[PDB]
Every structure is written in structure tokens, then in C-alpha cells.
Design a protein around this ligand. Structure first.
Ligand SMILES: Nc1ncnc2c1ncn2[C@@H]1O[C@H](CSCC[C@H](N)C(=O)O)[C@@H](O)[C@H]1O
Ligand SMILES: [K+]
Ligand SMILES: [Mg+2]
Ligand SMILES: [Mg+2]
Ligand SMILES: [Mg+2]
Ligand SMILES: [Mg+2]
Ligand SMILES: [Mg+2]
Ligand SMILES: [Mg+2]
Lengths: 71, 150, 326
RNA sequence: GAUUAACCCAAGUCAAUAGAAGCCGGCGUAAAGAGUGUUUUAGAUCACCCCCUCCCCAAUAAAGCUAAAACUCACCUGAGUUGUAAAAAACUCCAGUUGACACAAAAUAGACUACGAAAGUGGCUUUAACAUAUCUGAACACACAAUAGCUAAGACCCAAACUGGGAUUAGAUACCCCACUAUGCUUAGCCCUAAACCUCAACAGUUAAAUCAACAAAACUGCUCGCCAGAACACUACGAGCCACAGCUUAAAACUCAAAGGACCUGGCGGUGCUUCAUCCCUCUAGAGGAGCCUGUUCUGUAAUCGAUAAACCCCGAUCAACCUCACCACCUCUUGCUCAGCCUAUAUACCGCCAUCUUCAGCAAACCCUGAUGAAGGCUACAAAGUAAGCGCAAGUACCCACGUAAAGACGUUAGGUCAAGGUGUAGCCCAUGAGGUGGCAAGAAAUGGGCUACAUUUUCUACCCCAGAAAACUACGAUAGCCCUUAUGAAACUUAAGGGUCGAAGGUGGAUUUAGCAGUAAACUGAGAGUAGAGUGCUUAGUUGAACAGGGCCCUGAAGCGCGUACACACCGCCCGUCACCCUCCUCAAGUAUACUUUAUAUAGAGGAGACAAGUCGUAACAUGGUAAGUGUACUGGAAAGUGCACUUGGACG
């Protein structure tokens, strides 16, 4: 059989890799911002949980870990 | 075609086996002749060439060709006559060198026709001084209209 | 002012010195000649050119230097006999300098019709009328057949669409004679959709007129640049002193190919842009050259700097080859 | 669009929008079996009857070992070695021999088809070891998962992206050469991808029907899980998860299209394979291409035809132009005219008529029959296997001198081939003129080109003769059928045409690529006659005389035929397709500044990217032919990009 579908997939992948290479720095900055927003939203969800529970503050000895950071 | 190719291969194998065995002939066994090619139309055999020893090998092969054909008839019994061709690389070169030793020598741009174009230009100086294509499957036919009309 | 391209490297490769014979077959503006005279004042230089204006500039330099520089008006083919009668029949030329292309004064003048930017008669003739019987580009386009014009544009012009542009030119010429350079440019533009006027881009990746290549082709065919260049190279080799320095500048692929194949003794009929695989296949098919006569000063070509490209974009494609007669 | 007419419905008609009706169908190649195994909650009946898989292989992990080869080292010897298409560069403590010598890789066996869940696994030994006495059971749980890659530490013979150098190239890169790195190796982690493909889910059963869209790989049934619902957007965006940070898994929508796609058939094509051919090339003879002239065409000129015009025009219509012919031009004249008018006015791309071309062919088209499941299509084997009775052509017969040869014949079809100027004719046009008649006139060469004649001589020239001769033989030679002059023939008309004489003795000195013709009474040479004219050709037709040489060798080129292979082309390779390109449209994503929000984010628009379309071609020629360097998957590096290369895998390539 012909490889027209395979060729189209190859061209699409080549274009996508070229686009990633062209704008990898902007993509990295956007991803870092998204990770920051992710962590902030997760912390806000936990805060909402313990606020609805009635506790005036977080439980003693509890600190929300940075689960969305490479470090 | 493929059957003839297999027949050529079988003939090559049989001739090689006859050459290798000593039972066919002490002379042929001692020669240790090796075949470059075997092709059936008559059968043409081509053996690699090593002059004096080459001539001796050719003479012995020509002498023993009849016995080789007789032995092949024992096996493929209807075997056409076998022709041995000595492969002196390019045999023309060998024969030419032999004759030359025998022979006597006696005492010792732009890719265009710019001229034609220049002539044509001088001649000129002297004389001075798409659409739509309908698909084949969509063409109307009025035969049915005529048949229904009458 | 279009400064002579890589004139410093030309001076370096030639290395002018006192009491040496140097022939400039393409005097033209003379910037190379002026730099050479700046390096050495006692050098005996020959300024050969086909443009009568170039001969006038050479005579002006002769007014500056009465006999240090010697003018000469004529083509490369005539150059052999001209120099033989001049007094350099035994050759012994200490240096030879061969530029190529269009002189700055030639290109600027619209009357010569060397540029599509400025209108003028479709002359495209380096000769300024010294031989009025010499064909002009207008006569070339009006006279030559469809196949002849297509071959001219394909070979000389390195044009992909010769079969189309030649037919368009013939169709236009059948209505009116093609006597204006801008008229020819408009005709060639009409051979393609208007958006394709500047789609073709230079080696500098800068937009150029689509007709430019065509213009180039006509220029060459008007002046027989390839054949006359080959004759000039042969005459220089005949007249060059053993150990003399030959420096050439080539502004396009065809002339550079001719110069390189002459220097390396390669057959001119050999295929172009050969790869190693193609050479291996050729030799396998042939498996069943003349002795070298030059020593290359520079094995690889020398190209102008980016700054020189910005200063003189016309000289970007110039490639310099320096050798010594052996 | 208008108009006529017709059709459907009808106090309605029907433009838009919305709704009505739903997946018991499938998953090798079309969307779809996801790289692999296990189990859970469960489901199935294949768990009972009901039976056989320990044996012998290359599963895995660990430890140890080494035969061939390499590197290094040492001695001896040599001065070169290595390298290529050819070289250069490189090395010259380089090479060869001998000896010592591995954390690398595992010839032959292996033509075996084994082990493992898959990936994978092929040197030796040892240890440990290859789950389950019903099946099914997961993108995510559990555990694996080639190559590439990351992190760290080692090893490093060799190979090797990248890099440097050398060549090659117009040039850069690549293909080639050399050096060398990451990397391939070990240890410990990570990454979790593939054309992970037997492109066939697991288990059980069947070979009876209908065997079956096609191809692949015989067709199915039961059961279970997974998956798919037009193409593209999209192995993408967002969200989420991940040791991943240019990543992987899951995975959309808007705008847009009427197709996209799978298999096959026929044709075209292949820088397609093989085989065999011909005048395709060489071989033989005489020519053309150089000169003069004849003639034809073309161009110029003129007031001044037309047609043919690549083979298949070019001494062609013409078997023939001073007037006539004549259709051209100028001037003049006529209008029911020679014609119950006329036109040589347009259209050979409306035709008849007559032909060119392949054809120096052998096939063509009907009428049937059969095969493929009654798909497009196909239909041959002579010791014959679905083709065929007739027609046309070849053939046969006939003409000439035979039975040979030459003529003649030569179908269908190809080139809208030629002819509206043989004549006829369709359509269109002219009618005080595009019709008819009269007088007069072209017709020259500054040229180019085609064919022919005569030559350049000694195998010749002149004379005699019709083949036993004598002279000539280079500036008083050979060589004009040319020019000039004068006669003559024909004619009413002749420097025009022809013949003859005189005069002149010119160019030329066997002619380049290239090109024509011939296969035997042929080529070559010589001579006569005829058609046609009042006369007129170096033309045409035809009779005859003299009368040869080579007849072999080849497929590189050209072309043909056959058997094949491939085909994304069908406007049929000057094809198609892919990527590339500042600028208007549609759609998505999206940072700003300021309102709300708790100070970042949320939350209301707006730079910038992406998708599609647009004038579209330009640019590259990557893909489709062995598509010009087989294609492709994964991954990595380099490059602005077009891409290139490394490693493994796939055949959805080929082959002694
Ligand atoms: N065959 C030939 N004979 C003589 N001159 C020639 C020539 N071909 C080209 N030329 C001339 O060479 C020159 C090329 S460009 C001149 C460049 C000049 N050296 C300078 O000073 O820049 C023009 O003058 C052109 O007319
Ligand atoms: K093996
Ligand atoms: Mg795409
Ligand atoms: Mg299970
Ligand atoms: Mg892995
Ligand atoms: Mg290494
Ligand atoms: Mg595999
Ligand atoms: Mg399963």
C-alpha cells in the first residue's frame, strides 16, 4: 500500500518539532507560569477544605508541599 | 524462463560434479577445470582460463566432450551437446595480442551554434535595413430521450 | 561608488612589484588598476577592454601615467593579435587579472540597456558601437526561434521556464518589436502571474525582478562571454610568464565553472555539479587526464565579507580564484 | 435572464430553520485488536464426560572462563604505510614476520525454527530457574518493555552522530577519505518509544454449508475484553498524570471540504529487468554538403495571384506561364449578363470526389461461445488446456519473361494530413459587383536554401571508329547548357522561348560536420522514345545497352517485438505530489492597560502565534518507476531552513 497517511503524519510531526524548536523559550515560560497557577490553585483548594471544615487555620504542623516543582 | 534457469543451474552442477570426480577421467581430474557459466539454448559452457596450459586444457576438454555427454546421458538424460568456451577474459584481447606478436610492422564549447544564430541575426538586420474540460462521466446522453419520444 | 570587489585580495594575490608586466583584460572602471598602481608605480600594466568608454578611461589613466599604463580597446579574441603587435609577443606576463560581469559605468548608463530598472534600447552590448554590425539583444529576441531562444535562456540564463518565457517573448514580438528594456521586462513579467514579479530572490535572499536571469542570458549571448572568456584564458596562459600570478573573479556559476575547469584541466564537456557517487558510478561504467599546468594560490574560492556585501550587493556572488602558471 | 410551453401542488405555494427515524454493524490492508503478562469486582460454559506434552535446543539472573580477530608492546627486517573513482590529507616508532596480550564482539553449527509474556535471546562452564488441573479480565493498578536518550562512576579494541581536515562541487552541506567525541560496553538509577508487525486480540470448536467483495493469510461459529463511527484540523490545543522540562500517556473543538480512503482492472510511463531483432551502427558502391548553371522555395522589391510548405513542401498542383493560360495589378467598359444568371468570395475545422503517412504493416470489425460466483475485465499451449463458423486485409489469383522478381494490391485505424483553385456541394457572404469584358503590366537580386545538370580530367580531351588508331595533356590544358553578338524555328507579337553559329575560356582543382540511394541485370555510366505546346524544361514518364563491390560484425545510440516488474500518473512523467514564500478573509489559542477579585491569581478585551482559504505561482525536487541515493517507524545530534547522518526495527523494496 501507499504511505500517504504515514507521510502526512511525518510532515505534521516535522512541522510540530520545528514549531517547538522555534518557540521553546516562550513555551517554557508559559509552562512555568502554568505550574505556578497549578500550585496556587491546589493550595487554594486545600485552604477551602480546611475553611469549610471550620478550622480557623491549617492543622498544626501542616505545610502544603510544592508538588508541581522540579526541585 | 525460470524453468530454463533451473535447468541451467542443474547442468552447471552436473558438469561441476563430473569435473570434480576422478572416475570420469584421470586427465580431466588432474586438470581441475572450473566452470564460470553454463547456459542452455545446445549447451554453452564457459570455464575460467589460467597459454600452453590453457591450450592443453582446451584440447583435453574437446577430446573428452563426447565422453562427458555420454556420462551426462546416464543421469537429464536428454542432454544437448555441450560447447566449451574458453574465457580468456576478453578473448578478443588475447587473439589480438597473438596476431600483433605474429604481425609485421616493417622498419621502425558554449553548447550552441552561435555562428548560425549570428547569421540569422544578420539576416534579420538586413531584412529590416486554460479552459474548462468537462468530466467524461458527466456528459449527457439523449438516446433515452429519443427512445421515450418514439 | 561600487568599489572593486575584494580588490585588496586581488592586490595580495597578484603582489605587484617594480618592473613587472601585468595585464588587466577587464579594465572597465579601473579600480583594480588604480589599486595596483597605488601599490607599485613602476609596474607596466595593460588595460584591455571592449567598451570604448573603458578605453577612454584607460587613456585618461595614460594621461595620468604616460607609459606605465597602456590602453587597449578590443575583445579577448582580438587580444592575442593586439598584444602580439603591442610588443609582448613572447608573453612573459608577470600577472593577469580577469574580472567578469557588467562594468559600473556600463550598468548605470540606461542608454546601453544593461539594467531593467532604467528604460532604454534593448542593446545589452558591452561594445559601445565600435562594431555596429554586432548584434544587439533586441535583434536577438526578435530574430531567434522559439527553440533557439529557449535553449539560450536554459543554458546561458540557468532558467527553469525557458519553454514558457521564450514562447511568451515570441508572442509579444509577433505583435510589436521588442526595442525597450523595460518593455522586455514587462513582457517577461506577463509570462507569469503578477505576484511572481519579485518571488525569485537573490543569493542574498533579497527580492529581485523575475526577468533578471533572462537579461543576464541575453547579455552573455550578445557578447559571447563564455567563448570569449575561454579564448581570453587560453591567450593569457599562452602569454603568461611561467610562475606568473593569474587572478580571476567570477560573478555567476557558468564563468566560475569555466575558470575552474580551465585551471584544473577538467574537460569542459563533463557534467556539472558532480557528486562523489556520480563519479564512482561513471568510473564503474568506464571500468569495464592531461598533466597539471597550474598551482592554485587558494585551493578554495574567496568570497566577499558580509560588510562588503552590504556595501556592494552586486558583488556578493563574486568568487575569486588565484593560481600560478606551471 | 426574458419569452413560450409544460409539470407539481393549489388558497396556497415552499425559501430558511428546527424536528421526526438510530449502532444486535465492524476492527489484516478502509476509522478500529491498542508493545507484553497477571489479577481484582465480575462474566462465560470451552471447568465434569473430556484425553498428550517432563523429553532436545538461542528464556532469564549471577559468577568465572576464552578460540579467532584487534589494539598496545618487544625483537628482526623493510622505507614507506594507509586511502580513493582518481587523489589529497593523515601516519612514517610506519609496515611485514614472530611473541606476549581485553571490562570489546560472540565465524562455522544455523539449510536448525528452539526458549521467553512481549521486547528479546545463537561462545563455554556452573548455580539458581522457565507461574496457573477452566477460560476471559486494565492507556491509568502490579511488573516488564528494542534502539535512541538522560544522570553518575568506570572501561575504551573497534564502530560512531557531532566536530575538524581532505577531496568532490559554481559553491556550502551531503554522498567519499582521515582523525576524533557523545554514544554502542559495565555498575546504579531514569526515560517508557517503534513498521513494538505473524500489520492475524484471548479461549473453545468446526471443515459441513454459501468457500469467498478484492488482496493478504482457506472459510467460519461460540464466548469475553479492548477499540472504531467521514476526511482534515490532530502522534495537536487545553486539562490531568509522570524522576519525564524541546518529553511521554490520555486527547478535543472551531473554521473548512464532498469527498477522504481500501483492494483491483486497463492504459500511459519507468534515469525498468531480461530475451531477440532492424538496415539503428560499422562494413560496400556512387552521390549531396565546395564551384558554375537549370529549377523550386524563402526573403526583399514591385501596382501585382493562390495552394503545398517535419518526415508525408521545396522540377509540388504544372504531363509545364511571352499574349492566351490567369485566378494577380492598373486603367477603361457592361448590367437579366453564354446559363431559368453569376462569384477562383469565407469555411478542407461541414463534405463528396482523389490521395499522402505508418504500410518496407497483419491485423481489423461485426455475430456468437466460454471463463472470472455473471465486478472492471479475460479467452494461449499442436503429444494443444475455449475459443469460433463467416466478412475485410495480408495471403491466393492475375499483369510483365517462370514457380522468382517487379508491379499491382495493401483492411481498420493514426495525423480535424492535402485539396472549397479539378469538379460537385452544406453553411455564410457579393448582386451598378467579391460578377462579366477589353488594353497594358510584373517575372528584379543585396541574398539564403532545396533538388538537378555540367564539371574539376589521364579509366581524361579531340578526330576516326563503334573498342588493336593518331594527336592533346596546365596559361593557347581540362572546364559554361553562363554572358555578349548574329542567325534560324514557332508565333500576329521573341534582347523574352528553343535551336545553331560566332565570341568569351570564367569559377573550379574531388569539396567539414553531416547526409541520400542501393542487395543484381541492381547501383553506376551511356543512348533513344513519349506524354504535353504553335513553340518551350538540365523536368516527368518509359524502352534499351554496358554492368559492379559488400554481403559480415554488433546493441552503446535509435527503433521494434516478446516475457516480466513497479506504478500515489489517467490533461496519463512537459504527470502528480510534498515543503517553501512580507498581503487581505474565516476560526482557535493568546500575553497587555484598566473595572471586580485576595497581594498574586481569579475575572471582563487585546499584541502575538496556530489552522484553513485566497493571486497563486515562484523556489527545492523530497515522495510515486530500483522516482534518479530503496522507502518507512522510533530517537538523537547538526542546520535559519530545504534536510543530512548515527543506532535498532519493518517490507508496506529488489536481487546471483
Ligand atoms: N571579451 C571581452 N573583451 C574585452 N573586454 C571585455 C570582454 N568581456 C567583458 N569585457 C569588459 O570587462 C568589464 C567587466 S566589469 C569591469 C570591472 C572592472 N575591472 C572594474 O574596475 O570594476 C567591462 O568593461 C566589459 O565591457
Ligand atoms: K549463522
Ligand atoms: Mg499538516
Ligand atoms: Mg487472565
Ligand atoms: Mg527501554
Ligand atoms: Mg568513546
Ligand atoms: Mg520486533
Ligand atoms: Mg486480551
Amino acid at each position: 500500500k501507499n504511505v500517504l497517511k504515514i507521510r502526512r503524519r511525518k510532515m505534521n510531526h516535522h512541522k510540530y518539532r520545528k514549531l517547538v524548536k522555534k518557540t521553546r523559550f516562550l513555551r517554557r515560560k508559559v509552562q512555568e507560569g502554568r505550574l505556578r497557577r497549578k500550585q496556587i490553585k491546589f493550595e487554594k483548594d486545600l485552604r477551602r477544605i480546611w475553611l469549610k471544615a471550620g478550622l480557623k487555620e491549617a492543622p498544626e504542623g501542616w505545610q502544603t508541599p510544592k508538588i508541581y516543582l522540579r526541585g | 524462463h525460470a524453468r530454463l534457469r533451473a535447468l541451467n543451474g542443474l547442468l552447471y552442477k552436473a558438469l561441476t560434479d563430473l569435473l570434480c570426480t576422478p572416475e570420469v577421467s584421470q586427465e580431466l581430474y588432474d586438470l581441475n577445470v572450473e566452470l564460470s557459466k553454463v547456459s542452455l539454448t545446445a549447451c554453452r559452457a564457459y570455464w575460467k582460463t589460467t597459454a600452453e596450459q590453457n591450450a592443453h586444457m582446451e584440447a583435453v576438454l574437446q577430446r573428452s566432450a563426447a565422453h562427458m555427454r555420454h556420462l551426462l546421458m546416464s543421469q537429464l538424460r536428454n542432454v544437448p551437446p555441450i560447447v566449451f568456451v574458453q574465457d580468456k577474459g576478453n578473448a578478443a584481447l588475447a587473439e589480438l595480442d597473438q596476431l600483433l606478436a605474429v604481425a609485421d610492422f616493417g622498419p621502425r564549447l558554449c553548447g550552441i551554434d552561435h555562428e548560425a544564430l549570428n547569421k540569422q541575426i544578420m539576416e534579420y538586420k538586413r531584412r529590416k535595413d486554460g479552459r474548462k474540460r468537462a468530466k467524461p462521466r458527466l456528459e449527457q446522453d439523449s438516446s433515452l430521450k429519443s427512445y421515450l419520444s418514439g | 561608488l561600487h568599489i572593486p570587489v575584494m580588490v585588496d585580495e586581488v592586490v595580495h594575490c597578484l603582489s605587484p612589484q617594480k618592473g613587472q608586466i601585468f595585464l588587466d583584460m577587464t579594465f572597465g572602471s579601473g579600480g583594480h588598476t588604480k589599486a595596483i598602481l597605488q601599490k607599485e608605480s613602476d609596474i607596466v600594466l595593460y588595460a584591455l577592454d571592449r567598451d570604448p568608454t573603458a578605453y577612454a578611461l584607460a587613456e585618461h589613466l595614460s594621461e595620468l601615467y604616460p607609459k606605465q599604463i597602456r590602453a587597449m580597446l578590443g575583445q579577448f579574441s582580438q587580444a592575442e593579435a593586439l598584444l602580439m603587435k603591442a610588443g609582448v609577443q613572447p608573453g612573459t606576463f608577470d600577472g593577469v587579472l580577469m574580472d567578469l560581469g557588467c562594468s559600473s559605468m556600463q550598468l548605470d548608463t540606461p542608454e546601453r540597456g544593461f539594467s531593467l530598472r532604467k528604460d532604454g534600447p534593448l542593446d545589452m552590448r558591452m561594445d559601445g558601437g565600435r562594431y555596429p554590425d554586432m548584434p544587439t539583444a533586441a535583434d536577438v529576441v526578435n530574430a531567434l526561434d522559439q527553440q533557439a531562444l529557449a535553449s539560450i535562456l536554459r543554458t546561458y540564463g540557468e532558467e527553469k521556464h525557458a519553454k514558457k518565457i521564450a514562447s511568451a517573448i515570441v508572442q509579444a514580438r509577433s505583435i510589436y518589436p521588442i526595442t525597450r528594456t523595460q518593455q522586455l521586462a514587462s513582457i517577461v513579467a506577463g509570462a507569469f502571474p503578477p505576484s511572481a514579479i519579485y518571488t525569485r530572490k537573490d543569493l542574498l535572499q533579497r527580492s529581485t525582478h523575475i526577468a533578471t536571469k533572462t537579461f543576464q542570458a541575453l547579455r552573455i549571448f550578445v557578447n559571447n562571454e563564455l567563448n570569449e572568456l575561454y579564448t581570453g584564458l587560453k591567450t593569457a596562459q599562452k602569454f603568461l610568464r611561467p610562475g606568473g600570478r593569474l587572478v580571476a573573479l567570477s560573478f555567476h556559476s557558468l564563468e566560475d565553472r569555466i575558470v575552474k575547469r580551465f585551471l584544473l584541466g577538467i574537460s569542459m564537456t563533463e557534467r556539472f555539479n558532480l557528486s562523489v557517487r556520480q563519479q564512482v558510478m561513471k568510473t564503474s561504467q568506464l571500468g569495464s587526464r592531461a598533466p597539471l599546468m597550474w598551482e592554485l594560490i587558494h585551493k578554495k574560492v574567496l568570497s566577499p565579507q558580509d560588510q562588503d556585501v552590504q556595501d556592494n550587493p552586486r558583488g556578493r556572488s563574486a568568487k575569486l580564484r588565484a593560481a600560478i602558471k606551471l
